[PDB]
Structure formats: C-alpha cells, structure tokens
C-alpha cells in the first residue's frame, strides 16, 4: 500500500520559517523523483518543487526560488520542504507527490497559513429549533486559523447534516455553521450535540442544542 | 511559460450524458506530455490520463483523452455519479510544469425548491456582545438563489455572508447558509428579522421571520 504522509503545517508569521516533511512507504523511494505541489484555498494547483531520486538535482517554481529548499533523506524515506521568508501568497495546502511528472500518488496535504494574526479558538453557539421539518445547528464563530471539525453525536448522526464552508469575516476571523434538519416530532425524543474541534488552538467543545 | 486554458469553466449535465473538457496550451506540449486529474472536495487530486491519451491504473474506460500540440480533450463518455468533480490538466513538456485553472462538472437534476429556516442570535452570543442571524436553505436545485435580509422591513446590504455545501451525493442538491451580522445594540433596537429567498423552484419569493 503506497502512502505519502505530510507533516509540519500550521500558522506562520509573515516572513517566518517552516519546514515540511513527507513520509513515504509502499514503493521503493530511492527510485523516484519526489515533488511538492500546493493549492491555495479555493484556487488551482501550483507546482512548487521537485528533487531527483538520489537528491542529485533540485528544481523550483520562480516564486519560491531563493526562499524554499527541497531535500530528501533516502535512509529515512522522507522528503522535506524548508520554507523561508514566507508571505501571504504562500498560504496553501501543500501536497507531497511521487514522480517528476505526472503524479500518480499524492499525500493528503498539509495546510500552511502565513499571517500576522494570532491564534483564536472559536466560540460555539447553539442554533435552536422552534412539511413538518425542524432544523437545528451550531455556529462556530471567530476562530483562526482554519480548520475546525464538526460532527454530531460523536459521528453517529450524519444524515440530514450540513456542515458549511467557513466564511472569512471582515474582522480577519473565520465563522462556520453546521446544521441538521430532523422531523419536528423527534425534538422531544432525541438529544442533539455538536462536537467542535479546533486543533490550531487546542479547543474542543460539545454543545447540546435545545428546543426553544 | 506554458499557460493552460481550460473550458468550460463549469459544465452541467445529467448522468449518462457525454462530457467534453477542453485544455488549450499557449505553447506546443512536447511529446504530448499532458495529464488529466480529478479532484473532489477535500481530497488530493487523482491521475486519470497521462501522455495525453493513456489511462492510469484502475481508471474506468469511459475516461478517454485525445489531442496533441496545443489542443487536448478529456472525454467522459457516460457521466456517472462518481464523476462530478473538478478536472485539471497539466503539462510536463517544458519547465516549469503548469496546470490549467480547472473545470467544475456538476450533475443536472430536476428543480427542487429550498425549505427555509431562520435562527435568532443565541442568548449565549448576546451575552458575549455580538449578534448573528442565520438563514438556512435546505436541499434545493439549481445552485442559483437570492437570499435577502430585512430588518424591521429594511433591506440589508453588505452585512451578510453566505456559503454553500457541495452537491449532496444522494439527491444531488445544494444547501446554503447565510449569516447576517449586526451589533448587539442594534439587534435589541429592532423587532422583525426576515430572510427572503428567491429561487426558481418557488413561484414567488418566500419569507421566514421572527420577532425579537
């Protein structure tokens, strides 16, 4: 089983540094060039950097030349990306990929946010319920950086659930809602709890939402 | 640099129809070194075609690719439900490697009118000194929808934000969340809060409201 697994993303101050690693298994690492592709939120794919099988030759996109160094340890089956003088344009999900081109195996991505803003954990506010359908939810408000995680009833309830893409408020902070529609008459015979997790700030919240 | 121009931006088709996606290059692509990827929300990209026309491993034979020089085509002969994603082309004929801007393929289905719900600010949020009013449009199609906020019957402008889920895998609809933001002070000065939804499944705009 081929696996690529990035590590090392998170919030970074503008002009700061970060190193990413990508652990590989399931193929003979020392036979392939390895690659870093990135994707800004809501945007397309950008090739970032590539390194020869033996660590022998490196190449870069012009936007990162002189600030990013790609490297690899073939004793450790690990690919690295050292990132200096980071700017907001560098904010993206960073993917590890196999081959010089094209890319058959990709990692899961790691999110790198480049900003001056501090980390802020969200507040979680209940959206209470009053066709015959009711709707309830949670407002996960004023957090930074992305992402947050929402499940309902520790993952048991999934159907009728809608978790929305966060919005960037003009304050610089994110807000998202997650809702569930349920039959009105289930309101007295079910407990509804949203499980919110914001790993950047180590925040975890379970809020029961109650009828009015 | 080789610029890749994908078209159409968005393609909307009922399942079983033929999808045709175009990729045009600003320079000739050496050796027909052109790849096609599929990318679903929150997932890494997936290789479909390499060398302009060769299918990757485990790719159903309804994906086919053709072209050379500057004009390349990805054909999906019968659109299956698992096919509705973003499609990127990528050239590796000359450095640096570049991707096109992507084509969104959505599934067309019959019109479905939203059901609409409005949530007052939670008391918890009012204690902390802000006020968010939330309006929900549940399982509608097509995507296009006008959501308008009224406060004591005055049309709001510029103080709300909205977000849309991806197309639901069971009934192919969208849902929408709109958040109206106002100060706690102004919220407690007004009585009627209304969410006015316009959608082609509705014979005329629908309004949900509550009195503070």
């Amino acid at each position: 089983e081929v696996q690529l697994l990035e590590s090392g993303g998170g919030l970074v101050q503008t002009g700061g540094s970060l190193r990413l690693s990508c652990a590989a298994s399931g193929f003979t690492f020392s036979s392939y060039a390895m690659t870093w592709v990135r994707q800004a939120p809501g945007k397309g794919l950008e090739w970032v950097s590539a390194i020869r099988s033996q660590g022998d030759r490196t190449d870069y996109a012009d936007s990162v030349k002189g600030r990013f160094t790609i490297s690899r340890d073939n004793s450790q089956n690990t690919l690295y990306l050292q990132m200096n003088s980071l700017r907001a344009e560098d904010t993206a999900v960073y993917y590890c990929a196999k081959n010089w081109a094209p890319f058959d195996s990709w990692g899961q991505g790691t999110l790198v946010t480049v900003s001056s803003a501090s980390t802020k954990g969200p507040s979680v506010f209940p959206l209470a319920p009053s066709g015959g359908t009711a709707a309830l939810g949670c407002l996960v408000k004023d957090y930074f950086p992305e992402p947050v995680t929402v499940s309902w009833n520790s993952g048991a309830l999934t159907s009728g659930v809608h978790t929305f893409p966060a919005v960037l408020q003009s304050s610089g902070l994110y807000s998202l809602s997650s809702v569930v529609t349920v039959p009105s008459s289930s309101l007295g015979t079910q407990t509804y709890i949203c499980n919110v997790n914001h790993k950047p700030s180590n925040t975890k919240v379970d809020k029961r939402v109650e009828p009015k | 640099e080789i610029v890749l121009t994908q078209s159409p931006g968005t393609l909307s088709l009922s399942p079983g129809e033929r999808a045709t996606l175009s990729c045009r290059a600003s320079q000739s692509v050496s050796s027909s070194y052109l790849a096609w990827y599929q990318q679903k929300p929150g997932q890494a990209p997936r290789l479909l075609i390499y060398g302009a026309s060769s299918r990757a491993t485990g790719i159903p034979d309804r994906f086919s690719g053709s072209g050379s020089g500057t004009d390349f085509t990805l054909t999906i002969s019968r659109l299956e439900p698992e096919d509705f994603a973003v499609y990127y082309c990528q050239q590796y004929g000359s450095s640096p490697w570049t991707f096109g801007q992507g084509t969104k393929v959505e599934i067309k289905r019959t019109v479905a009118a939203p059901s609409v719900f409005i949530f007052p600010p939670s008391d918890e949020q009012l204690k902390s000194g802000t006020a968010s009013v939330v309006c929900l449009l549940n399982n509608f199609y097509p995507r296009e929808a006008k959501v308008q906020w009224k406060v004591d019957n005055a049309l709001q402008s510029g103080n709300s934000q909205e977000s849309v889920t991806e197309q639901d895998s069971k009934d192919s609809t969208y849902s929408l969340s709109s958040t109206l933001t106002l100060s706690k002070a102004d919220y407690e000065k007004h009585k009627v809060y209304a969410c006015e939804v316009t959608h082609q499944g509705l014979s005329s705009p629908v309004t949900k409201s509550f009195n503070r």
């Binding site: 036979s31 060039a33 390194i51 | 390499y50 060769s54």
Partner: peptide, 11 residues
C-alpha cells in the same frame, strides 16, 4: 511506461 517521468535526469 511511455509518458511517465519517474525521475529527473542528471544535469
């Protein structure tokens, strides 16, 4: 496989 560049050449 023709059309896969598994590795970069030496330069």
């Amino acid at each position: 496989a023709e059309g896969i560049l598994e590795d970069m050449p030496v330069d």
